[PDB]
C-alpha cells in the first residue's frame, strides 16, 4: 500500500475529530496492524486506521469504541519526493471497519497518504493537501 511515514500519534493521544458526527476528540487506544515490541507504544500516522474513544461530544458517542482514521498530524513525515509535510493539528475521522465514514463532511485538509488508501474519505475531503 502506502510507504512508511513518521509516526507521531502513540496510544493515549487525543486528536481533533474533523467531521460532522458530533464528536470533538478521539482518544487513541490502539492501532491496526501493530504486532508489538516489549515496551513500545503503538504509534499511528496519517492513513492508519485506529481504535479511538470520544472524550468530548454527543453523549451517544463518548462511551464506546470507534474505528477512526488519522487524516492529519503535526509530526513532519518525508514523502518520496523529499518533501517534509506537517499540519498544524492532529485530526481523525470516525469510520467503519470497511473504511466508510460516519459523517458526511470533513473540516480541513486531508493528507494525500490518507486519501489514496481510503477512497471513501477522499470523496468527502474539502481539499487534499
Amino acid at each position: 500500500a502506502k510507504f512508511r511515514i513518521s509516526l507521531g500519534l502513540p496510544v493515549g493521544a487525543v486528536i481533533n475529530c474533523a467531521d460532522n458526527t458530533g464528536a470533538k476528540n478521539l482518544y487513541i487506544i490502539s492501532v491496526k496492524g501493530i504486532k508489538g515490541r516489549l515496551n513500545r507504544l503503538p504509534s499511528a500516522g496519517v492513513g492508519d486506521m485506529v481504535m479511538a474513544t470520544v472524550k468530548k461530544g454527543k453523549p451517544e458517542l463518548r462511551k464506546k469504541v470507534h474505528p477512526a482514521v488519522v487524516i492529519r498530524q503535526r509530526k513532519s513525515y518525508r514523502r518520496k519526493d523529499g518533501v517534509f509535510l506537517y499540519f498544524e493539528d492532529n485530526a481523525g475521522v470516525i469510520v467503519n471497519n470497511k473504511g466508510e465514514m460516519k459523517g458526511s463532511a470533513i473540516t480541513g485538509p486531508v493528507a494525500k497518504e490518507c486519501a489514496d488508501l481510503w477512497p471513501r474519505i477522499a470523496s468527502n475531503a474539502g481539499s487534499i493537501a
Binding site: 502506502k2 510507504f3 516489549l38 515496551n39 518520496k80 519526493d81 523529499g82 489514496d116
Partner: protein, 394 residues
C-alpha cells in the same frame, strides 16, 4: 524463573568481537567466483569517501505508487582516481587452503607507492626494490623472470594483481598509496597472466572495472566512537531514574548458574571502527574527472540530460572536512561505512543480480550542489551572484 515477557536479543552475535579493527583499509575476504568464459577484468577497486548529496530522478517501476514520478535519493560520492598496477601474484590450491606461489613486481615503482613499504620515509634511504628492479635490464635476470611467469601459467589457479592508488591526486595530506590484490576472474590462467603482464606500471580507470546501474559491495572500516556504554554500544534499555549506582547499565548480567558471565551478555567497551561489508550498493553515476579538452578545464561531471548546466560535483565551498574531487568519482545510492576521506574497497557482487531493483536503469535529472557547510541555498556561485546582485566587496 523464565523471563516474564519475551523480547528479542539486543545486537547480533555474528559481529563479535566488537574490537578496533587491526586493519585501516578494508579487506576483500572473498572474491567473486571465476567464470573462464567472460573476458579478463578486475573484480575490485579502491575509493575514498568524499561526501554525500541527494539527486532527483524519475522512477520507472511498473506496479509502484511512485512510478513515472520524481524522487529524491540520498547518494554518496566516492572519488576513484585510476590505480597503477605494480605487481602480479599467483596462488596455488592446497588441501589446507590457498598458498602464495610467487610474486612479480614491475621495473619502475612510483615514489608514492614505495611510501607504503616504509614507516619513516623522511629519514630513510629509499632503497626499496632497488636490487629487484635490476632483473628487467640484465639479460640473465630476464631469463629467470620469464621462468617465473611461465611457472604461474602452470602451477597457479588464482591470479591477482597488486595495484596502488595515486594519492598524489587527492586532497588528503597523506602521501602513501594503498596497495591491494585485485583478483582477475576473466579466463584461463595463461590469459590472466598475459593480461596482467602487459598492464604493469599502467593505469586502470574506474570506467573499466565497474559500469552504470550496477550493484557492488563496499568493504570498509566504520567510524569509531571510542569506549561507549552498554546503552550506546548494544542499545539496551535505560534503567529508570531512581536507579542507584547508575541507570545506563545492564541490570542482570547472568544467572547464578553458570557461575560465569556469558559472551552473549551485552557489556561496555569500544564501539565503532569495525570492519564491515555492505552489499547491493547500486551505482547511480560514474563521473569523469577534470580534463582540458580544448585548452580550458571542463567541470560537466554533475550536469544531466535534463539540467544542461555547467556545474561540477563539488558543492559550494567543496565537500566539508574532505575537499574537492577532481578525479573520476563513483556516485553510490545511500550511505557508506566510514568517515570522510576514508578508503573504501569496492567489489563486484557475489550474487546474481536479476531482481527488479538490481537491473533498473537510472536517468538522473538533477544533482544537488548546494553548500553542505550549513543551510546552503544556491547550486552555483554564478546563481548566487545573479540572485543577490553586486555586494559591497566590488
Amino acid at each position: 524463573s523464565h523471563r516474564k515477557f519475551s523480547a528479542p536479543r539486543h545486537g547480533s552475535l555474528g559481529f563479535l568481537p566488537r574490537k578496533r579493527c587491526k586493519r585501516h583499509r578494508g579487506k576483500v575476504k572473498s572474491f567473486p567466483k571465476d567464470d573462464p568464459s567472460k573476458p579478463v577484468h578486475l573484480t575490485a577497486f579502491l575509493g575514498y569517501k568524499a561526501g554525500m548529496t541527494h539527486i532527483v530522478r524519475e522512477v520507472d517501476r511498473p506496479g509502484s505508487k511512485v512510478n513515472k514520478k520524481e524522487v529524491v535519493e540520498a547518494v554518496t560520492v566516492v572519488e576513484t582516481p585510476p590505480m597503477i598496477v605494480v605487481g602480479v601474484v599467483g596462488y596455488v590450491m592446497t588441501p589446507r587452503g590457498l598458498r602464495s606461489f610467487k610474486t612479480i613486481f614491475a621495473e619502475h615503482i612510483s615514489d608514492e607507492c614505495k611510501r607504503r613499504f616504509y614507516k619513516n620515509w623522511y629519514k630513510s634511504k629509499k632503497k626499496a626494490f632497488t636490487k629487484y628492479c635490476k632483473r628487467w635490464q640484465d639479460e640473465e635476470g630476464k631469463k629467470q623472470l620469464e621462468k617465473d611467469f611461465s611457472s604461474m601459467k602452470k602451477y597457479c589457479q588464482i591470479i591477482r594483481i597488486i595495484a596502488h592508488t595515486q594519492m598524489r591526486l587527492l586532497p588528503h595530506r597523506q602521501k602513501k598509496s594503498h596497495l591491494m590484490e585485485i583478483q582477475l576472474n576473466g579466463g584461463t590462467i595463461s590469459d590472466k597472466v598475459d593480461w596482467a603482464r602487459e598492464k604493469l606500471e599502467q593505469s586502470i580507470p574506474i570506467a573499466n572495472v565497474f559500469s552504470q546501474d550496477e550493484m557492488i559491495d563496499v568493504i570498509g572500516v566504520t567510524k569509531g566512537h571510542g569506549c561507549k556504554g552498554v546503552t550506546s554500544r548494544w542499545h539496551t534499555k535505560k534503567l529508570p531514574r531512581k536507579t542507584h549506582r547508575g541507570l545506563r547499565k545492564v541490570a542482570c548480567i547472568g544467572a547464578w548458574h553458570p557461575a560465569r558471565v556469558a559472551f552473549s551478555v551485552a557489556r561496555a567497551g569500544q564501539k565503532g571502527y569495525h570492519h564491515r561489508t555492505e552489499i547491493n550498493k547500486k551505482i547511480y553515476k560514474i563521473g569523469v574527472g577534470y580534463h582540458n579538452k580544448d585548452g580550458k578545464l571542463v567541470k560537466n561531471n554533475a550536469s544531466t540530460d535534463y539540467d544542461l548546466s555547467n556545474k561540477s560535483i563539488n558543492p559550494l565551498g567543496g565537500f566539508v572536512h574532505y575537499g574537492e574531487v577532481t578525479n573520476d568519482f563513483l556516485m553510490l545510492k545511500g550511505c557508506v561505512v566510514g568517515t570522510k576521506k576514508r578508503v573504501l574497497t569496492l567489489r563486484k557482487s557475489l550474487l546474481v543480480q536479476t531482481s527488479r531493483r538490481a537491473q533498473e536503469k537510472i536517468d538522473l535529472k538533477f544533482i544537488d550542489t548546494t553548500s553542505k557547510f550549513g543551510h546552503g541555498r544556491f547550486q552555483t556561485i554564478e546563481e548566487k551572484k545573479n540572485f543577490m546582485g553586486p555586494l559591497k566587496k566590488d
